[PDB]
Design a protein around this motif. Structure first.
Motif, short mmCIF file in Angstrom:
data_model
loop_
_atom_site.label_atom_id
_atom_site.label_comp_id
_atom_site.label_asym_id
_atom_site.label_seq_id
_atom_site.Cartn_x
_atom_site.Cartn_y
_atom_site.Cartn_z
N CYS A 120 0.85 -1.29 -0.02
CA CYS A 120 -0.07 -0.07 0.04
C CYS A 120 0.79 1.35 -0.11
N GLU A 121 1.86 1.39 0.99
CA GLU A 121 2.78 2.37 0.84
C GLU A 121 3.43 2.75 -0.33
N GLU A 122 3.91 1.48 -1.04
CA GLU A 122 4.77 1.73 -2.14
C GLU A 122 3.74 2.02 -3.46
N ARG A 123 2.84 1.60 -3.24
CA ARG A 123 1.73 2.07 -4.55
C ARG A 123 1.62 3.90 -4.13
N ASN A 124 1.44 4.20 -3.00
CA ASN A 124 1.30 5.47 -2.85
C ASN A 124 2.50 6.36 -3.32
N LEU A 125 3.62 5.55 -3.04
CA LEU A 125 5.03 6.68 -3.42
C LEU A 125 5.02 6.60 -5.11
N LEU A 126 4.58 5.49 -5.63
CA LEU A 126 4.59 5.55 -6.98
C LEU A 126 3.65 6.68 -7.61
N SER A 127 2.23 6.57 -6.97
CA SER A 127 1.43 7.73 -7.58
C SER A 127 1.90 9.06 -7.01
N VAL A 128 2.32 9.20 -5.99
CA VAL A 128 2.59 10.42 -5.52
C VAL A 128 3.79 11.04 -6.69
N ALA A 129 4.74 10.30 -6.73
CA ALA A 129 5.85 10.71 -7.61
C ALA A 129 5.33 11.36 -9.19
N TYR A 130 4.60 10.43 -9.88
CA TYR A 130 4.00 10.50 -10.91
C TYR A 130 2.96 11.45 -11.06
N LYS A 131 2.26 11.69 -9.79
CA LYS A 131 1.08 12.94 -10.03
C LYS A 131 1.93 14.08 -9.90
N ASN A 132 2.96 14.27 -9.19
CA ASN A 132 3.87 15.73 -9.21
C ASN A 132 4.51 16.00 -10.49
N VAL A 133 5.21 14.89 -11.06
CA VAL A 133 5.82 15.10 -12.46
C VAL A 133 4.79 15.67 -13.39
N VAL A 134 3.66 14.87 -13.51
CA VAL A 134 2.78 15.10 -14.75
C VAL A 134 1.90 16.26 -14.27
N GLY A 135 1.90 16.73 -13.04
CA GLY A 135 1.07 18.00 -12.54
C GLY A 135 1.95 18.88 -13.16
N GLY A 136 3.41 19.04 -12.84
CA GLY A 136 3.82 20.17 -13.21
C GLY A 136 3.86 20.52 -14.70
N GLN A 137 4.06 19.29 -15.54
CA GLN A 137 3.75 19.32 -17.05
C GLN A 137 2.69 19.86 -17.54
N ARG A 138 1.40 19.46 -16.73
CA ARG A 138 0.07 19.89 -17.07
C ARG A 138 -0.10 21.18 -16.87
N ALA A 139 0.40 21.99 -15.75
CA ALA A 139 0.31 23.45 -15.66
C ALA A 139 1.16 23.92 -16.31
N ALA A 140 2.45 23.63 -16.91
CA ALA A 140 3.09 24.32 -18.09
C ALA A 140 2.32 24.26 -19.47
N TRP A 141 1.83 23.09 -19.66
CA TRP A 141 0.89 22.93 -21.01
C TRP A 141 0.02 24.03 -20.74
N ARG A 142 -0.74 23.96 -19.64
CA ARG A 142 -1.90 25.07 -19.88
C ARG A 142 -1.46 26.53 -20.07
N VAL A 143 -0.42 26.95 -19.53
CA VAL A 143 0.22 28.21 -19.54
C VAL A 143 0.76 28.47 -21.09
N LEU A 144 1.14 27.60 -21.73
CA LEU A 144 1.72 27.69 -23.14
C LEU A 144 0.33 27.44 -23.72
N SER A 145 -0.47 26.80 -23.89
CA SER A 145 -1.71 26.72 -24.52
C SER A 145 -2.64 27.77 -24.39
N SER A 146 -2.50 28.62 -23.32
CA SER A 146 -3.07 29.91 -23.17
C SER A 146 -2.62 31.16 -23.96
N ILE A 147 -1.23 30.99 -24.00
CA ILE A 147 -0.50 32.05 -24.71
C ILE A 147 -0.55 31.65 -26.23
N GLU A 148 -0.74 30.60 -26.79
CA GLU A 148 -0.73 29.98 -27.73
C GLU A 148 -2.22 30.42 -28.60
#
Ligand SMILES: *Cc1ccc(S(=O)(=O)N2CCC(OC)CC2)cc1
Ligand SMILES: *Cc1ccc(S(=O)(=O)N2CCC(OC)CC2)cc1
Ligand SMILES: [Ca+2]
Ligand SMILES: [Ca+2]
Lengths: 9, 228, 228, 9
Positions: free
Chosen positions: B42-70
């Motif tokens: 259970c704890e390892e699944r949470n570590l996997l999920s937290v790691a990727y949610k943070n990585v993709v969360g920053g990518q999504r936020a950047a994509w939204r900034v750029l999509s708005s400028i575009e």
């Protein structure tokens, strides 16, 4: 709309 | 890339990377741990999920900034850079989906693990859908929907209505309906029913479980307030 | 790696990367722009500095978290991971120092550009000194000191005491004295003299220049309050 | 002790 933040263990 | 590091060392380093706010490293350590081939606790699944949610969360936020400028601008630079960020985001989502398919889901027999992984599968297809266009978009949307629906079916049969994974799954599937599938009424109905059925089960919980369930219930209520 | 992209496109993408909070990309675009071989304008120098300060600032924060965990613990994992982050930080500092040496400083003839680059050189040697041990530490400390001192000598001859680069240089050199060189009295004396000489020159400034200078003066005062 | 934040253009 907010999903699970999910960014802290 | 992590093949020479012990599983337990990868897990320890993922926890250190979280403390250091080094989420790309965290995700790479947890990918290495998954690729050892053993099921995750259970704890390892949470570590996997937290790691990727943070990585993709920053990518999504950047994509939204750029999509708005575009979109406001409508040279090639903004589109080119939005495309670069988009491709990187898609690559991370494909990596997570590949871990789930090889072989986390097929080995997950308990409801808690299988629902968790299917919720992840829905989430990462949802992130792909956010950047998809046209007909590719339709199949990606259906892949998210199918993963969430299987997770929902298991969760309703096997978990109490206050279970935090069941609640977070319902929250995220409601966001899918509202934001991706153009089904705001389905989003509202799912959030309301989930909230009400959890409320009626709070009496069964300890003080600590009550705190966990009510925190997610508040997120459901926050969305209902925004949507109604 | 950026050799096929136009200089102006690299600059535009660095500005977009800043807006998207993609500082690693920002630094890579600005490295590409420097490697085109032309001198940098004031705004371009700021983009280069902002990009690398953000990248190395996150590495330094992570290194401090890991170093603290390692010191409390005194398996190999914490030290190994601290070492990995340390090596990455050193590599970024070496990259910036290499841009300054090939060939930003030697081509910088105006006081504003030469002081800016020498301040950067002091800063990145200071970040190397933060993680260095022993005798390597001594030579690295002297390299930071030498760069800051040359920048100070030029700034005092060529810029008014309220110039924001002159002020930020003095601030960072005072931090060097306090935190690196074990010279708190020198740090306090430099911060006090810098503050007082800037105060006496504020009357010469427009409203916008006044705002820029007083903001840095407040940072000098904040340190003096902490140090006295 | 604070150096120049220097993290916003
Ligand atoms: C998707 C999701 C739902 C709920 C959470 S949590 O932070 O409330 N929590 C639930 C209990 C544990 O089981 C996995 C750990 C996570 C997080 C993500
Ligand atoms: C090192 C340093 C000093 C001052 C600044 S700033 O934010 O006040 N500013 C000064 C005016 C411009 O000239 C370069 C741009 C930066 C930043 C960094
Ligand atoms: Ca082993
Ligand atoms: Ca050209």
């Amino acid at each position: 709309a907010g999903s699970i933040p999910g960014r802290r263990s | 890339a992590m093949g020479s590091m012990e599983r337990a060392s990868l897990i320890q380093k993922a926890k250190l990377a979280e403390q250091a706010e080094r989420y790309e490293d965290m995700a790479a350590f947890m990918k290495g741990a998954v690729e050892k081939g053993e099921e995750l606790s259970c704890e390892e699944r949470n570590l996997l999920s937290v790691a990727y949610k943070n990585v993709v969360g920053g990518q999504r936020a950047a994509w939204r900034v750029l999509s708005s400028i575009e979109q406001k601008s409508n040279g090639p630079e903004v589109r080119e850079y939005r495309e670069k960020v988009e491709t990187e985001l898609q690559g991370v989502c494909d990596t997570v989906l590949g871990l789930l398919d090889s072989h986390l889901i097929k080995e997950a027999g308990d409801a808690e693990s299988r629902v968790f992984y299917l919720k992840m599968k829905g989430d990462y297809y949802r992130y792909l859908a956010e950047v998809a266009t046209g007909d590719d978009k339709k199949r990606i949307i259906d892949s998210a929907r199918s993963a969430y629906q299987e997770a929902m079916d298991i969760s309703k049969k096997e978990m109490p209505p206050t279970n935090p994974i069941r609640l977070g799954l319902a929250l995220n599937f409601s966001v899918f309906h509202y934001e991706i599938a153009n089904s705001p009424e389905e989003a509202i109905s799912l959030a309301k029913t989930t909230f009400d059925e959890a409320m009626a089960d709070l009496h069964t919980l300890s003080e600590d479980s009550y705190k966990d369930s009510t925190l997610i219930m508040q997120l459901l209520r926050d969305n209902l307030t925004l949507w109604t």
